[PDB]
């Protein structure tokens with residue numbers, strides 16, 4: 001089952017919702033991720049160029065997919081097949097961001 | 106500010122998350138809608154043909170936009186510019202549905 005993260009659109013995109021699979025994949029409970037930017041999932045061997053591509057896509061509200069090294073709560077590395085998309089209203093305003101995570105380790 | 110609803114993808118799409126704007130637009134608190142299908146927003150003057158188009162689009166996991174008559178918790182009608190889209194993983198599996206609501210009554 002694929003993980004899902006929903007964030008606010010503005011400020012530093014704090015997490016507002018995660019599904020059950022997110023907790024299975026990452027080892028984090030909803031309570032200890034809500035209100036935080038998802039970058040806490042990154043660690044020492046995370047590719048800086050990949051992070052920079054995500055940063056630019058989110059700033060521009062462009063859809064992007066990356067295979068990125070992430071870390072479970074316990075510190076074990078896993079490969080995250082990550083896809084991020086903006087959620088827009090009819091006038092094109094960004095209402096939220098949705099991220100979908102697949103463990104492809 | 107536009108409302109947002111997230112639902113599970115299967116078994117009649119129970120609500121799993123709503124944003125603050127959803128409560129402002131509809132008059133329902135998150136506690137009053139979690140675990141329920143969003144169709145409680147509909148009422149007697151809601152256009153049946155519009156509801157049918159939503160039902161067929163959601164069953165097929167196809168994005169859909171409709172202007173639909175909805176009802177606040179207290180019964181006040183409002184026009185809802187509603188956009189529903191499936192959230193897919195890279196294998197094409199539907200993970201969730203996302204709905205965006207704009208009150209266009211004015």
Ligand SMILES: Cc1cc2nc3c(=O)[nH]c(=O)nc-3n(C[C@H](O)[C@H](O)[C@H](O)COP(=O)(O)O)c2cc1C
Nearest residue numbers: 005007013037038039041042051054055097098099
């Ligand atoms: C909805 C959403 C979900 C995200 N999910 C992840 C994730 O699962 N893993 C990850 O490493 N980064 C994820 N990110 C990206 C980070 O939150 C952040 O945007 C990225 O590291 C680039 O920004 P920074 O340079 O400020 O860290 C997600 C971002 C958004 C908006």
Ligand SMILES: Cc1cc2nc3c(=O)[nH]c(=O)nc-3n(C[C@H](O)[C@H](O)[C@H](O)COP(=O)(O)O)c2cc1C
Nearest residue numbers: 110112118142143144146147159160202203204206
């Ligand atoms: C994510 C999502 C959000 C929805 N939001 C609304 C809404 O704001 N107003 C509404 O009348 N119906 C909304 N619906 C549609 C109903 O939940 C239902 O799918 C529709 O009425 C057709 O099904 P039915 O014939 O079983 O009622 C939404 C559906 C989904 C999946």
